[PDB]
Amino acid sequence: KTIIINGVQFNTDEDTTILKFARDNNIDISALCFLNNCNNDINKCEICTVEVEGTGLVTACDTLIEDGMIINTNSDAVNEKIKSRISQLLDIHEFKCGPCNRRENCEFLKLVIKYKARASKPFLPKDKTEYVDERSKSLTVDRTKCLLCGRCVNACGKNTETYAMKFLNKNGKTIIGAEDEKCFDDTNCLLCGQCIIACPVAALSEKSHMDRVKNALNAPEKHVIVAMAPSVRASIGELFNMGFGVDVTGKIYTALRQLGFDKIFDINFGADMTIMEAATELVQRIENNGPFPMFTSCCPGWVRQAENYYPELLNNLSSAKSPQQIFGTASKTYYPSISGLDPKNVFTVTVMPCTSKKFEADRPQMEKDGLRDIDAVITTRELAKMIKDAKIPFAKLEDSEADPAMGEYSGAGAIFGATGGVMEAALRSAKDFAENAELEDIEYKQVRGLNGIKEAEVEINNNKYNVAVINGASNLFKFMKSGMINEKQYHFIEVMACHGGCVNGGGQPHVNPKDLEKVDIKKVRASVLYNQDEHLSKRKSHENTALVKMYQNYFGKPGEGRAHEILHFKYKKS
Numbered sequence: 001k002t003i004i005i006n007g008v009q010f011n012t013d014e015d016t017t018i019l020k021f022a023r024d025n026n027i028d029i030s031a032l033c034f035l036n037n038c039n040n041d042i043n044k045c046e047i048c049t050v051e052v053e054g055t056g057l058v059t060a061c062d063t064l065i066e067d068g069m070i071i072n073t074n075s076d077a078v079n080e081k082i083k084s085r086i087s088q089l090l091d092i093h094e095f096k097c098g099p100c101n102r103r104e105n106c107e108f109l110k111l112v113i114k115y116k117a118r119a120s121k122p123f124l125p126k127d128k129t130e131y132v133d134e135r136s137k138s139l140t141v142d143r144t145k146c147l148l149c150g151r152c153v154n155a156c157g158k159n160t161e162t163y164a165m166k167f168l169n170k171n172g173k174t175i176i177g178a179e180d181e182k183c184f185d186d187t188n189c190l191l192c193g194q195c196i197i198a199c200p201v202a203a204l205s206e207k208s209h210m211d212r213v214k215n216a217l218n219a220p221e222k223h224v225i226v227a228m229a230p231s232v233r234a235s236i237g238e239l240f241n242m243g244f245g246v247d248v249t250g251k252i253y254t255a256l257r258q259l260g261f262d263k264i265f266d267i268n269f270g271a272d273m274t275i276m277e278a279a280t281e282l283v284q285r286i287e288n289n290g291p292f293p294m295f296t297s298c299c300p301g302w303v304r305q306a307e308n309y310y311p312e313l314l315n316n317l318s319s320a321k322s323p324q325q326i327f328g329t330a331s332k333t334y335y336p337s338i339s340g341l342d343p344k345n346v347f348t349v350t351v352m353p354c355t356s357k358k359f360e361a362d363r364p365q366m367e368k369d370g371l372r373d374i375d376a377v378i379t380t381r382e383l384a385k386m387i388k389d390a391k392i393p394f395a396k397l398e399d400s401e402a403d404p405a406m407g408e409y410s411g412a413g414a415i416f417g418a419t420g421g422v423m424e425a426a427l428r429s430a431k432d433f434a435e436n437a438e439l440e441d442i443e444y445k446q447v448r449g450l451n452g453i454k455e456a457e458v459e460i461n462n463n464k465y466n467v468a469v470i471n472g473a474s475n476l477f478k479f480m481k482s483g484m485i486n487e488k489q490y491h492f493i494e495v496m497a498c499h500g501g502c503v504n505g506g507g508q509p510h511v512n513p514k515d516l517e518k519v520d521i522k523k524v525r526a527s528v529l530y531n532q533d534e535h536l537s538k539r540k541s542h543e544n545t546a547l548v549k550m551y552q553n554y555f556g557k558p559g560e561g562r563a564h565e566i567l568h569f570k571y572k573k574s
């Protein structure tokens with residue numbers, strides 16, 4: 001093929017789109033609705049417009065290159081077309097970036113500035129009530145910002161295959177939303193928030209818990225515990241221009257103390273708790289062989305998927321609570337026993353890469369004696385805004401350390417945030433439990449990586465067993481519908497709703513579509529977690545000394561008695 005772009009001749013054999021070929025050759029072409037190898041098929045944004053000699057204006061994102069093409073990307077005809085489309089977008093857009101939560105990383109704003117477009121008439125609603133949906137515990141919609149780009153719809157379809165996010169004909173006007181414009185919570189939605197990640201503007205956002213946290217911090221009698229997820233320490237640095245794959249664990253601990261938190265713990269401690277219970281349960285299910293297979297239950301996105309599509313698998317779920325909820329339960333019981341705090345004055349706050357964790361925290365039965373396991377959940381993004389509002393120089397902060405009582409963790413807990421992390425951590429303890437030994441080779445590299453479905457054979461005391469790792473909600477559908485589950489007898493199965501694991505959660509920092517082409521965000525975020533595992537002295541959950549102390553002095557032996565009564569949760573089918 002011979003291609004002419006802006007006067008420059010190219011010789012190539014590649015078969016691809018005009019957009020992709022120009023990006024690879026350092027030729028600038030703007031785009032808006034093109035994402036995840038998809039554009040808005042029904043109403044294309046046409047921001048990727050180029051001029052092909054002899055044909056006219058075309059969309060570069062979905063037009064293949066042909067030999068003999070002469071292409072102009074910057075002609076006056078092209079720029080006025082693009083500028084016209086942006087101006088029409090401005091006509092339906094509340095353009096007040098001041099108090100906007102995407103102000104410093106909005107894609108639409110960069111386009112408005114680049115082409116210097118203005119609205120035919122500013123869109124200024126008097127009552128945003130009709131435009132805003134805040135009914136969900138996890139997700140919120142602001143349709144005064146929505147560009148109808150369809151990127152959230154496509155992301156939902158690709159990541160989950162549920163299509164819980166749809167286009168809707170509302171009063172004869174097109175919107176996006178849940179089925180029959182119901183609250184997302186009341187549909188087959190998983191609340192994974194992958195739609196939010198895909199959104200170029202502030203139309204989709206997480207349900208804010210920042211007022212819960214601030215009211216608690218200022219309440220004199222409240223003792224506010226904070227604990228962050230594995231993934232947060234490996235990603236929040238992005239929002240402070242520190243780059244990708246930067247471990248900022250110690251900086252976060254310092255920042256949380258300066259925010260006014262009374263106690264600094266860590267969810268990885270809770271991760272070690274979940275392994276103690278789940279590995280014991282797996283070893284138990286082997287003594288009786290069954291019921292097989294055992295599924296993990298630490299991902300609420302997956303739990304909802306099971307409830308909504310495969311309720312017969314609910315009885316196969318591990319009864320152990322998620323690290324978030326199991327940590328919260330201990331924070332209202334064990335922690336007062338070693339602090340003398342009144343349990344009702346304890347207020348437990350987690351930092352999560354996940355929107356679905358808000359729903360899990362607000363489950364009705366996720367409490368005991370009137371005390372919630374978790375009282376508030378804030379996302380990575382929420383923590384970042386909170387730090388900036390306090391004007392805390394995050395990048396310059398010195399490393400501090402979490403409080404030891406529920407802040408220590410092993411390398412097994414550390415890797416929870418990556419896909420296959422839970423599988424590997426559980427095998428390290430369950431294999432030591434059943435064989436009654438302390439094995440030294442603890443790395444399970446087969447269950448790692450970004451493959452959608454991963455499988456391995458393991459030998460646990462005398463015998464062979466089959467494990468599988470499901471990476472992404474759409475892959476769960478494939479595993480089940482294709483009958484892969486019935487090809488052999490599986491004994492232990494890990495399921496994560498977000499592809500890549502929690503490091504790619506719905507509450508994570510946004511990334512510019514082109515930076516995504518430079519950086520593999522899923523592996524770069526996960527590398528930090530495996531790094532910590534490598535350089536940690538303790539790499540098994542049952543070697544966690546602060547955790548062993550807790551079980552010996554308070555809970556007893558994991559998997560039965562006291563431990564089973566309050567550190568476990570069961571899901572019932574209607």
Ligand code: 402
Nearest residue numbers: 229230231323324354416417502
């Ligand atoms: N609870 C919990 Fe988990 C833990 O530990 C997080 O905190 Fe995850 C992360 N990062 C999230 O959200 S949930 C799914 N299990 C793997 S990691």
Ligand code: SF4
Nearest residue numbers: 097100103106201202
């Ligand atoms: S979505 Fe972007 S362009 Fe619209 S108000 Fe917010 S920052 Fe400004």
Ligand code: SF4
Nearest residue numbers: 146147149150152199
């Ligand atoms: S909610 Fe966001 S991603 Fe979805 S159509 Fe509107 S602007 Fe696009």
Ligand code: SF4
Nearest residue numbers: 156189190192193195
């Ligand atoms: S939260 Fe997840 S399942 Fe629900 S609409 Fe968004 S992407 Fe789809």
Ligand code: SF4
Nearest residue numbers: 299301354498502505
């Ligand atoms: S994979 Fe992690 S971030 Fe995604 S829904 Fe599940 S728990 Fe939340």
Ligand code: FES
Nearest residue numbers: 034044046048061
């Ligand atoms: S980016 Fe090509 S039509 Fe939208």
Ligand SMILES: [Mg+2]
Nearest residue numbers: 216217218219
């Ligand atoms: Mg206070």
